[PDB]
Design a protein around this ligand. Structure first.
Ligand SMILES: C[C@H]1[C@@H](SC2CN(c3nccs3)C2)[C@H](C(=O)O)N2C(=O)[C@H]([C@@H](C)O)[C@@H]12
Length: 267
């Protein structure tokens, strides 16, 4: 706050970055928005609504179905799937890995499970449309979805759009309570987000999140946070550093600082 928009702009200059932030309005707080309707690549953030789509589409015990895969299926960072290729992974294990480790092979297999044209990308986009998101689009799977040139609309969402999607999934009634809890718990146990939105909120706030990182210095985090008294907020922070070209380093610190600024306003 000096003001908030000024603080975000200062961060953009510091990190030679484009920063997008959205926090939906609540009973007593106005929406926080900065470049909130600009498009940014999903990166692995899409895996959160992907898991919601797969959960919604199937009986709960579909989680117990074993999926087999092999060498040519490992095409992207896949910390868990690389370890289990010899035995296979259940849908539940794939959901766990896709969310908690940003496992790209897991995401790819879940896309294939959802099925339909574009290896599942069309049905994934259709799931978002069913939640009233007319903005986001997924066009490729991993790793290609991380590589669209700056400005290209393929594989993008916006801080505004993805926040409203996440709000419905975790806080709203997009999913029945049992599936909602599975999704929430996986994000609660995320391993990839300690230096992002989590870094910006006091330890007595609960944080669940799904990160994303890609080329052109892309670094995102979408989260639901709860105050010490149980008041929830949805926080979407997205960034890229197109000025550094394809190999621009993603800079988590930017997201941590942006989240700290948001937390200051929400406290
Ligand atoms: C690039 C990963 C991660 S960030 C990357 C994983 N990293 C580290 N692992 C151990 C130490 S740092 C850096 C990054 C992420 O979510 O943070 N993300 C995606 O988005 C892909 C894609 C395969 O789903 C991946």
């Amino acid at each position: 706050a000096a003001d908030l928009a000024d603080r975000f702009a200062e961060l953009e200059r510091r990190y030679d970055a484009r920063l997008g932030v959205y926090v939906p309005a609540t009973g007593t707080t106005a929406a926080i928005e900065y470049r909130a309707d600009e498009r940014f690549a999903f990166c692995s953030t899409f895996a959160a609504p992907l898991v919601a789509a797969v959960l919604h589409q199937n009986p709960l015990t579909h989680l117990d179905k074993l999926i087999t895969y092999t060498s040519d299926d490992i095409r992207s960072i896949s910390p868990v799937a690389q370890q289990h290729v010899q035995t296979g992974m259940t849908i539940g294990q794939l959901c766990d890995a896709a969310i908690r480790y940003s496992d790209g092979t897991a995401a790819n297999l879940l896309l294939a499970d959802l099925g339909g044209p574009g290896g599942g990308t069309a049905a994934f986009t259709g799931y978002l449309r069913s939640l009233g998101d007319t903005v986001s689009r997924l066009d490729a799977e991993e790793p290609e979805l991380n590589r669209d040139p700056p400005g290209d609309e393929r594989d993008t969402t916006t801080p505004h759009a993805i926040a409203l999607v996440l709000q419905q999934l975790v806080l709203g009634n997009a999913l029945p309570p049992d599936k909602r809890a599975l999704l929430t718990d996986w994000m609660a146990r995320n391993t990839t987000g300690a230096k992002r939105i989590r870094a910006g909120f006091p330890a007595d706030w609960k944080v669940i999140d799904k990160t994303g990182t890609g080329d052109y210095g892309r670094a995102n985090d979408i989260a639901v946070v709860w105050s010490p008294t149980g008041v929830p907020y949805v926080v979407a922070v997205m960034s890229d550093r197109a000025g550094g070209g394809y190999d621009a380093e993603p800079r988590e610190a930017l997201l941590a600082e942006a989240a700290t600024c948001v937390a200051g306003v929400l406290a």
